[PDB]
Write a protein that binds this DNA or RNA. Sequence first.
RNA 1: GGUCACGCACAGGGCAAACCAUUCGAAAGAGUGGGACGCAAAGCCUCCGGCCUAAACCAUUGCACUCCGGUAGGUAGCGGGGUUACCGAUGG
Length: 87
Amino acid sequence: RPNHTIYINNLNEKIKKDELKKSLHAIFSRFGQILDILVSRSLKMRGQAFVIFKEVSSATNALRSMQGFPFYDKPMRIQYAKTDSDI
RNA sequence: GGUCACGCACAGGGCAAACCAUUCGAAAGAGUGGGACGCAAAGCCUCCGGCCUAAACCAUUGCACUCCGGUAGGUAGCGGGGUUACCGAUGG
Ligand SMILES: [Mg+2]
């Protein structure tokens, strides 16, 4: 079930792609080193985020420690990634 | 000569990329002035495709690692297509 990547859900879609990544990096980096943050604003990708960690353990902490956390007046919905491409 | 093509020139020369200044714009970008990388339609039109922007509105709770909702705006110097047009290689 666990994964290097965490699937953040229910995000404010009004945030600019640049700020969104930036803020997510500014909030999740305290859990572990981040490879890259995948954010896209297409109809299929809106309000969603993929945060890829070096270590699954750091992804595990980030999920458990910050599930529900209000972010741009909206509660984050963190769950594990189903499948993970890249490293 | 007219027309339909064509560009190896000729003559008048035309336009003006990047960058800078300034204006408008949420932005992409455009206007104007300076400036020239190039352009035989780099004149003009967003009909078809591509690409860029996403402030408002509409819709979307969506598992990606080609890239993508509508609506709107932009690019005609991204192609196609439409339309107009100067010169005329003893030119075809
Ligand atoms: Mg011609």
